[PDB]
Structure formats: structure tokens, C-alpha cells
């Protein structure tokens, strides 16, 4: 019965989110949860999984993307087939760099225009960021980077050959990885400056310190939401972004950008700092880390939905029956909350 | 309407399959910009050589016509050549006078 | 009676009634106080 | 109680600029050419640079134009698909009639 | 005050402007963060002069 | 129609974000006009000579 | 008595020209060069001047064309918001039926 | 039971790139002309190219 | 021009003209521009 029950759970997740089984699997892979043995999953994890699937599925419907499109953006299973697009890339880059000298260049800056030329990219500043991102990720079986790529390209690759050498398998996967990251940039709709910051200093966006920035389903949602937030800021977005990269952003500035009372953000900032959150909110990250910004904004959005101050929301949280085991809020405290 | 959908798809296939597609221009832009930048440094070097020759000839190693910034990264180097041409013209005028 | 309109204050029944009367929160009520009184160095007013 | 529909809203987009400053000058070199000659050589080089500049500007304009046409065709395709659904509903409506 | 507010309110409606657009135009409180738009301005003028 | 609104916004963002946007040309015009003016004076001086 | 509405009326705009007079000449200078030499040098400068003039006109045409595209696009967005309100009312009308 | 129809479906197409790489340089030749002469002649043909 | 360059400066291997200016995929576009840069580099080397 246990096995039957576990098969049934997997089926329900797919039916519930309008996915086929194949699609459920691809989504779980994109989520990162797919490697988990669902049959022996803890309850906390299962509920978490449902919430992640719900969030992501809703988002894909919102973005009008298929699961396959998401999968393409999140997958690390790069193909090895050498296609015309890559053959053209390799010849272009190969020739562009025949005179390349690292002593006078960081390589990435030089490749950036040739890569943009071959990725069908409008800006080499993005190509620069993409190559950098790829180096941090080290995609493919070869854990490829731009420097490894160049050593190979200059030493083994023969332009116009069509046969090359057997190490080309790693090269092909690297090249696809660059294309993958390119699609992420474009589909995300992220500002070029914001993108460079994400790739260069991922901690600003909530990455674990030192981590290569992820391109899995959660990362893509986060970036997408960031981009939507920036568009909302509109013409005042430049001020806010400049103050994000340079850690000067504060409540008054963001509130002005968002047409809010600064006191709304200040109080929400305080409540975010008073309450325990998974990424804790402290004075040091309240307007510097994106996840702390989202936390503060959620305090605000809830306060807005209920037409109450952030202080009111905080008081309601304080009535949590589990936490009440020590506080035992009095009837009077409840009367205030009702008021 | 179904016909229009098919026709739209045909127009799109044409737009993507024709030689003069977006991919072509992205390629051309990238390659030319790379050339343009290198050409710019060489152009500057000759302009500087003319400037040093000017300074030598008139015994005045202080005069300056060539300023930094002809190439503005923000605008991908546009009008850098025009900027240099003005500097050369200024030298010519100074020399004649 | 004093009513603490500081946006950071906690409430009481008088404060609640005032918000109720105007259908506004504490943050905007504080600002309302500053609109009416630019001299008050605090958020406290008497229930005059 | 009649539930009155909510107001529509405008969509926004940001257009935050990027920025790169200009370049530094290369080191001066003492060429053996006299200024009146070196000037002409520098001038010819600048002219070639300005020709590339013009060409690059035209490429960029072409690049952007093609990108727009691709966008527009994709947008048309999306709207047609919706219109097909609408027309199909018209047929269903007639069956109801 | 009421008369001035009415004049402005009517007018902003007529011009289809939000109060926020008005505020941007009338505010004397200016931003201090140095943004790309200004960096480009400073280079443009710096070299021009 | 809601889709058309979205598409319209996308097209607008494209026009604002594409390299050859209004800001570019405003910049190029201004910078070139300044060059053209100075060049004119030099050309006139040469003609007077 | 029915309150017959006033007729709609035309809008019009003023388009008042600005005016700036032309340039004055700088002082004449006698250089060492004989007339045919300077004539050619002057011709060279004028040709380069006309080349810049051509470039400037082309930039201007693009500047203005782009401003128009942006204007039209913003206008399209405004009309869509109005159309969304109309369609919402159309749905409400059907609910009334 | 009413035979409710399926939703309209999207169309798609492929536009797979072709690839033609470059060739080799032709054999060089030693001209009887000095470098600056040949340099300009080459400049001339490249301009024509 | 490259061979003349080499003879005058007593070089056996100097190279500016490289293969690849003509990319068949792109119908030879920008081949001239590519060569013009290489010739300019050759000239600069001569001058220095």
C-alpha cells in the first residue's frame, strides 16, 4: 500500500499543476528537488515541494512559458552535437583572437564582442557578463572556462575543419551553456547593469557567499521579480539601482522611488528586523540584499492588503498560538488586535 | 483567420531565413566594432605622432590638440573619428599661423 | 487625554477610534498630524 | 451586492542607462616624418576611421530594425492565436442559436 | 488653501498628470546618488569644455 | 486587449532600450553640432588665408 | 426640453519660428603659402566641412524620426487603456443581459 | 454530449544556420616595389574592396 | 605589401595578413575592413 500511495502522490502533483508525468519530472529537475526520493520524503519537505511547484507553475503560467522552455534555461545536460551555429562561433572567435595576448588583456573583454557577434547579442557588455558567469559555473563535463576554451581554440581548433579533435565535446557544451545564459538574460528582461551586478556579486541577490550565481528555477524567478520591481520604479530606477550597487540605498530613497511614505518603509524595516526571518534582516542588509528588500516589501504588501500599518501586522503575528504558549496574549491584547 | 496564422508563420520564417536577418547584423556589428576600436587606437597613434612632430618642428613641447576621451565607451566610439579630425584641423591652423 | 500618533506607537482604544473615524492607518495618521501641526516636536496630542 | 470590476492600470518600464567613460591617450612617439607630411598621414587615417564610424552606425540601425520586425511578427502570431479562439466561440454561439 | 488646491487638482486632472509628476517638477529636494546618466553628463561636458 | 497592452509596453521598452534610441541621437547631434561649429570656424580661417 | 449638447471643435497649435542670425568673419591672415596652395587647402577644409554637414543632417533626421516613434508608441498605450475600459463595460453589459 | 473543440494551436518553424568557414591565404609574391608604394597600392585595392 | 615590408626591415616571419577576412557564412562582408585594419597595423609597425 505504501508504494501505491507514493506513486499516487507523484501523480497528484502532476495533475494538480496540470503537468504530464514527463513534465513533472522536468519541472522537478528545474526546481532542484527532483533528485529527492519522494517516496521517503519528510512531511516538511513534501509541503515545501508542493509550495515550490505551486509557485513555479504559477509563474510559468504568468510568464506564458512552457515547462520545456524553463527546463532549457535550467538544465545542465548540455548536448555535444556540433552544430553550424557553433561552427560559426568557433571560426569567428578563432580569427578574432589571432593576436590575442593575455599580458595586455583579461581575455573576457576581448572575447565579449566576438561572442556577442555569434550569440546574436545586441551588447558586448552582456557578453562580458555571460562569459564571466559561465566561468564561475564551469559548465560541461570539462568544467569549461574562457581560458580553457581559448587554449583549445588556439592550439587544437582548425577553422573550417568540421572534424577537430575529441575534446570538442567539452567545447560544444560550453558554447551551449553560453547560449543558455544568453536566453536567460533575454527572457528575464533584466537591466544590463543589474545583470552585471548579479553575475559579479551574487550575494546582493541573496546568493550564498562565494556561490556561482544559479540559473535554476528559483534563481530565474528571483531575477524576474527583481526586473519587474525595477520597471515599477521606472524613471527613478536609476537612482535606486545606483544606490543598490553602491550600498547607500535607504528607506527615504526607496520610498521616494516607489511613491511611498518613508515611514511605511521605516516601520516595515524595523519589523523585518524585529521578527525572525530565514535570511535575517539586520540594519546591514535591509536595503542592500535583495532578499531583505523582498522581506521588507512583503511586510508592506501585507500591511497594504489589510489596510493597516506594519506595526499592526506585527501585532497580529505576535498572536501566533504556538508563540502564545509563553506570551499567552490576554483578552485585552486581542481586543487591541481586533481594533 | 487560420490562413492568416499560416501566412504570419510564413512571414516569420522568411524573416528569419532570409540572408539579411538579425543574426547577420549582430554579427556584423560585433565584428566591425572590434575592428573600429582597434583602428581607433591606431588612428590616435598617428595623430599623436603628428602632434609630436608639430611640437618638435616649432620647438614647443607643450602644445596640445589631442585630448583623451575621443572614444566614449557609452556610445561605442561613435564620432571618435570626427573628434580627432577636429584636433588635427586645429593643429593645422596653429601651424599655419 | 493624550493620544500618541507617532507612526511607531502602539495603539489603544482612543487611537483606534481616531483611525476608524478617518479609515486610515498609523503611518498616514502621523503624516496627517504633521500636515496640521509642523511645530509639534512629538506625535502626542491631547484629545481636545 | 454587485461586485464592481477594478480599474485597469498602465504598465511601466525602466530605461536605465549604462555608462563607460572615454579612453586614455597612448604614449607619444617621435616619428621621423615632418609635421606637414605626418599631418596628412594622420588625416588619411582619421578619414578611414570616420568611414568605419559611419558604417558602424548604419549597421547598428539595421540591427535594431531587424530586431523590431522579428518582435512584431511574434506579437502578431500571438494575437492571431487568440483571435482563432474567439472565432471558434462565435461558431459555438451560433450552434447555441 | 482650498482654492489653490482645487485649482491644481482640476488642472492635474485636465492635464492627465499625477500628483507625483507635479511633485517631481516642483520639489527642491534633490537626489545625491551618482547615476549613469550623470556620469555620462559629466564626461560629455568635461571633455566639451 | 490585455495582451495588446503588454505587447505595446514591450515594444515601447524596446524602443527605449535599443542602442539607437532617442538618447543616442540627441547625444550625437549635440556633440557633432559642437564639432561642426568649431570646424566651420577653422574652415573659414583657411578660406580667408 | 432636451439639453442639446454643444458641437465639438477643432484644435490647433502655434508654430512660432525662432531666429538666430549668422556668423561674422574672423580677421584675415596672410600665411606663407601662395594662392593655389591655400586654395587647395581651403578646398580640403570646405569639403570636410560639407561632409560633417551631411552627417549632421542625417543625425537630425534620425533624432526626429525616433522622437516620433516614441511619441506614437506612448499614444498607442494610452488608447489601449481606454479600450480596456470599454471592453470591460462590454462584458458588464452582457452580464446585464 | 456537445463535442467541445480543442483549442487553437500555435505554429512554429526552424531556421537552422548554414556554415561556411574561411579558406587559406593565396601564395605571397615579392614585388619589385618598395614598401610604402605597395602599401598604398594595397590601401587602394582594399578601399575598392 | 607584406613581403616588401619584410624585405625592408629584414624580417623573415612578420605577419599581418591573416586568413579569415572572408567568411563564406557571411558572404565576405567586412573582408575589406578586416584587411584595412591589418594594413594599418603593418604601417604602424613600419613607422615605429
HEC per residue, chain A = CHHHHHHHHHHHHHHHCCCCHHHHHHHHHHHCCCCCCHHHCCHHHHHHHHHHHHHHHHHHHHHCCCHHHHHHHHCCCCCCCCCHHHHHHHHHHHHHCCCCCHHHCCCHHHHHHHHHHHHCCCCHHHHHHHHHHHHHHCCCCCCCCHHHHHHHHHHCCCCCCCCCCCCHHHHHHHHHHHHHHHHHHHHHCCCHHHHHHHHHCHHHHCCCCCCCCCCCHHHHHHHHHHHHHHHHHHHHHHHHHHHHHCCCCCHHHHHHHCCCCHHHHHHHHHHHHHCCCCCCCCCCCCCCCHHHHHHHHHHHHHHHHCCCCHHHHHHHHCCCCCCHHHHCCCHHHHHHHHC
Task: Using an 8 Å CB-CB cutoff, list chain B residues near A120.
Answer: 22-23, 26-27
Distance CA C14, CA C10 (A): 11
Q: Experimental technique used? A: cryo-EM
Distance CA A215, CA A201 (A): 15
Q: Which of A88, A94, A98 sits opposite I25 (nearest CB)?
A: A88
Distance CA A29, CA A8 (A): 19
CB contact at 8 A, I36 and D48: yes
| D91 phi and psi angles, rounded to 5 deg | -65, -45
CA-nearest of A113, F25, D29 to B41 is D29
CA-nearest of A288, A312, A284, A313 to A298 is A313
| D10 phi and psi angles, rounded to 5 deg | -70, 150
Residue of B nearest to H16 (CA): B17
Contact flag D85-H7 (C-beta cutoff 8 Å): yes
Could you tell me the sign of the dihedral formed by the alpha carbons of A288, A289, A290, A291, in that order?
Answer: negative
The CA distance from I40 to the nearest CA of chain D, in Å, is 8
Contact flag B11-D47 (C-beta cutoff 8 Å): no
Count of C-beta atoms within a 10 Å radius of residue G70: 15
Contact flag I48-D48 (C-beta cutoff 8 Å): no
Compute CA distances A179 → A121, A232, B37, whole Å: 10, 29, 25
Element spanning H41, H or E: helix H35-48
Bridge partners, C45 (sequence order): C3
Bridge partners, C4 (sequence order): C44
Q: Angle at Cα A96 formed by Cα A92 and Cα A99, nearest 5°?
A: 150
Q: Which of D25, D70, D83 sits opposite B44 (nearest CB)?
A: D25
Q: Is D68 on the interface with F (CB under 8 A)?
A: yes
Compute CA distances E6 → E1, E2, E3, E27, whole Å: 8, 6, 5, 20
Q: Which of A122, A125, A231 sits opposite D14 (nearest CB)?
A: A231
Q: Is H7 on the interface with D (CB under 8 A)?
A: yes
Report the SS3 class of residue H49.
coil
Compute CA distances A149 → A92, A126, B29, H35, whole Å: 14, 19, 23, 38
Q: Which three cell numbers stand for residue A228?
A: 519587474
CB contact at 8 A, C33 and C5: yes
Contact flag D5-G84 (C-beta cutoff 8 Å): no
Q: Which of D85, D92, D95 sits opposite H8 (nearest CB)?
A: D85
Element spanning C46, H or E: strand C44-46
Distance CA A230, CA A257 (A): 10
Element spanning C2, H or E: strand C2-4
What is the DSSP-derived secondary structure letter of residue D22? B
CA-nearest of A127, A123, A122 to A110 is A127
Distance CA A298, CA A304 (A): 10
CA-nearest of A147, C14, D53, D18 to F35 is D53
CB contact at 8 A, I40 and B41: no
Element spanning D26, H or E: none
Task: Using an 8 Å CB-CB cutoff, list chain A residues near F13.
Answer: 231
Interface list for G 26-65 with F (CB within 8 A): 26-31, 33, 38, 41-42, 45-46, 48-49, 52-53, 55-56, 59-60, 62-63
Bridge partners, B72 (sequence order): D22
The CA distance from D50 to the nearest CA of chain E, in Å, is 19
Contact flag D88-H11 (C-beta cutoff 8 Å): no
Interface list for I 1-48 with A (CB within 8 A): 18-20, 23, 25
Could you tell me the sign of the dihedral formed by the alpha carbons of H49, I4, I8, I13, in that order?
Answer: positive
Report the SS3 class of residue I19.
coil
Burial class of C12 by CB neighbour count within 10 A (0 to 12, 13 to 18, 19+): middle
CA-nearest of D22, D25, D42 to D33 is D42
Contact flag H22-A160 (C-beta cutoff 8 Å): yes
CA-nearest of B77, B67, B74, B68 to B35 is B77
Could you tell me the sign of the dihedral formed by the alpha carbons of D42, D44, D47, D53, in that order?
Answer: negative
Element spanning C3, H or E: strand C2-4
Distance CA A338, CA B54 (A): 86
Distance CA A13, CA H15 (A): 36
Supply the DSSP string of B36-93, one letter for each residue.
HHHHHHHHHHHHHHHHHHHHHHTT-TT-----S-SSBGGGTTTTHHHHHHHHHHHHHH
**CA F48 from centroid of its chain's CA atoms:** 33
> Which chains form contacts with chain D, at 3 or more CB pairs under 8 Å?
A, B, E, F, G, H, I
| A186 phi and psi angles, rounded to 5 deg | -70, -40
Contact flag D29-I36 (C-beta cutoff 8 Å): no
Q: Which of G29, G45, G55 sits opposite B97 (nearest CB)?
A: G29
CA-nearest of A88, A184, A2, A216 to H18 is A88
What is the DSSP-derived secondary structure letter of residue E32? -
Distance CA I39, CA I16 (A): 7
Contact flag B86-F46 (C-beta cutoff 8 Å): no
Length of chain I: 48
Contact flag F8-G77 (C-beta cutoff 8 Å): yes
Contact flag D13-F4 (C-beta cutoff 8 Å): no
Distance CA I18, CA H45 (A): 17
b/e sequence A160-189, b meaning 16+ C-beta within 10 Å: beeebeeebbbbbbbbbbbbbbbebbebbb
**Reported structure resolution in angstroms:** 3.7
Q: Which of I30, I36, I40 sits opposite B28 (nearest CB)?
A: I30
Contact flag C16-A339 (C-beta cutoff 8 Å): yes
Residue of E nearest to F32 (CA): E48
CB contact at 8 A, A217 and A70: yes
Count of C-beta atoms within a 10 Å radius of residue D97: 5
Task: Using an 8 Å CB-CB cutoff, list chain G residues near F22.
Answer: 63, 66-67, 70
Amino acid at each position: 500500500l505504501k508504494n501505491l500511495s507514493n506513486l499516487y502522490i507523484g501523480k497528484l502533483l502532476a495533475d494538480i499543476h496540470q503537468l504530464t508525468i514527463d513534465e513533472l519530472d522536468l519541472l522537478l529537475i528545474a526546481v532542484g528537488e527532483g533528485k529527492t526520493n519522494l517516496s521517503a520524503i519528510s512531511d516538511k519537505q513534501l509541503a515545501t515541494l508542493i509550495r515550490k511547484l505551486n509557485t513555479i507553475t504559477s509563474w510559468l503560467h504568468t510568464q506564458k512559458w512552457s515547462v520545456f522552455q524553463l527546463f532549457i534555461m535550467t538544465s545542465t545536460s548540455y548536448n555535444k552535437t556540433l552544430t553550424p551555429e557553433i561552427k560559426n562561433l568557433l571560426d569567428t572567435v578563432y580569427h578574432g583572437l589571432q593576436g590575442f595576448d593575455k599580458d595586455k588583456a583579461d581575455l573576457l573583454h576581448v572575447m565579449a564582442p566576438y561572442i556577442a557577434a555569434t550569440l546574436q547579442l545586441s551588447s558586448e557588455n552582456v557578453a562580458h557578463s555571460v562569459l564571466l558567469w559561465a566561468d564561475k559555473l564551469q559548465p560541461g563535463d570539462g568544467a569549461m572556462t574562457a581560458e580553457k576554451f581559448w587554449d583549445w581554440l588556439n592550439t587544437k581548433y582548425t577553422p573550417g575543419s568540421s572534424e577537430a579533435v575529441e575534446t570538442q565535446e567539452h567545447i560544444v557544451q560550453y558554447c551551449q551553456a553560453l547560449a543558455q545564459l544568453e536566453m536567460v538574460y533575454h527572457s528575464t528582461g533584466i537591466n544590463e547593469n543589474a545583470f552585471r551586478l548579479f553575475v559579479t556579486k551574487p550575494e546582493m541577490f541573496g546568493a550564498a557567499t562565494g556561490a556561482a550565481p544559479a540559473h535554476d528555477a528559483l534563481s530565474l524567478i528571483m531575477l524576474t521579480r527583481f526586473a519587474d520591481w525595477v520597471n515599477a520604479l521606472g524613471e527613478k530606477a536609476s537612482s535606486v539601482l545606483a544606490a543598490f550597487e553602491a550600498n547607500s540605498l535607504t528607506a527615504e530613497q526607496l520610498a521616494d522611488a516607489m511613491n511611498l511614505d518613508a515611514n511605511l518603509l521605516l516601520q516595515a524595516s524595523i519589523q523585518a528586523q524585529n521578527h525572525q526571518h530565514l535570511p535575517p534582516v539586520t540594519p546591514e542588509n535591509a536595503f542592500s540584499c535583495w532578499t531583505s528588500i523582498n522581506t521588507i516589501l512583503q511586510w508592506v504588501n501585507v500591511a497594504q492588503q489589510l489596510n493597516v500599518a506594519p506595526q499592526g501586522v506585527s501585532a497580529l503575528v505576535g498572536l501566533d498560538y504556538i508563540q502564545s504558549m509563553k506570551e499567552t496574549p490576554t483578552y485585552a491584547q486581542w481586543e487591541n488586535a481586533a481594533g | 483567420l487560420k490562413t492568416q496564422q499560416e501566412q504570419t508563420q510564413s512571414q516569420l520564417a522568411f524573416l528569419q531565413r532570409k540572408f539579411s536577418n538579425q543574426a547577420l547584423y549582430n554579427w556584423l556589428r560585433g565584428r566591425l566594432a572590434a575592428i573600429y576600436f582597434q583602428f581607433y587606437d591606431l588612428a590616435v597613434a598617428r595623430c599623436l605622432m603628428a602632434e609630436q612632430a608639430y611640437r618638435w618642428e616649432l620647438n614647443d613641447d607643450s602644445a596640445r590638440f589631442i585630448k583623451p576621451g575621443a572614444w566614449q565607451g557609452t556610445y561605442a566610439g561613435l564620432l571618435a573619428g570626427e573628434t580627432l579630425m577636429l584636433s588635427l584641423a586645429q593643429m593645422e591652423d596653429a601651424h599655419l599661423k | 487625554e493624550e493620544i500618541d500618533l507617532n507612526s511607531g506607537s502602539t495603539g489603544d482604544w482612543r487611537k483606534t477610534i481616531l483611525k476608524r473615524a478617518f479609515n486610515i492607518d498609523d503611518v498616514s495618521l502621523f503624516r496627517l498630524l504633521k500636515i496640521t501641526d509642523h511645530d509639534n516636536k512629538d506625535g502626542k496630542i491631547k484629545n481636545n | 451586492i454587485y461586485a464592481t470590476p477594478a480599474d485597469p492600470k498602465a504598465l511601466l518600464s525602466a530605461a536605465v542607462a549604462t555608462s563607460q567613460g572615454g579612453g586614455k591617450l597612448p604614449e607619444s612617439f617621435m616619428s621621423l616624418w615632418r609635421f606637414p607630411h605626418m599631418l596628412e598621414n594622420a588625416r588619411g587615417m582619421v578619414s578611414q576611421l570616420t568611414q568605419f564610424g559611419s558604417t558602424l552606425q548604419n549597421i547598428i540601425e539595421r540591427q535594431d530594425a531587424e530586431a523590431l520586425n522579428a518582435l512584431l511578427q511574434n506579437q502578431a502570431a500571438e494575437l492571431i492565436l487568440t483571435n482563432l479562439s474567439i472565432q471558434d466561440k462565435t461558431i459555438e454561439e451560433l450552434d447555441a442559436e
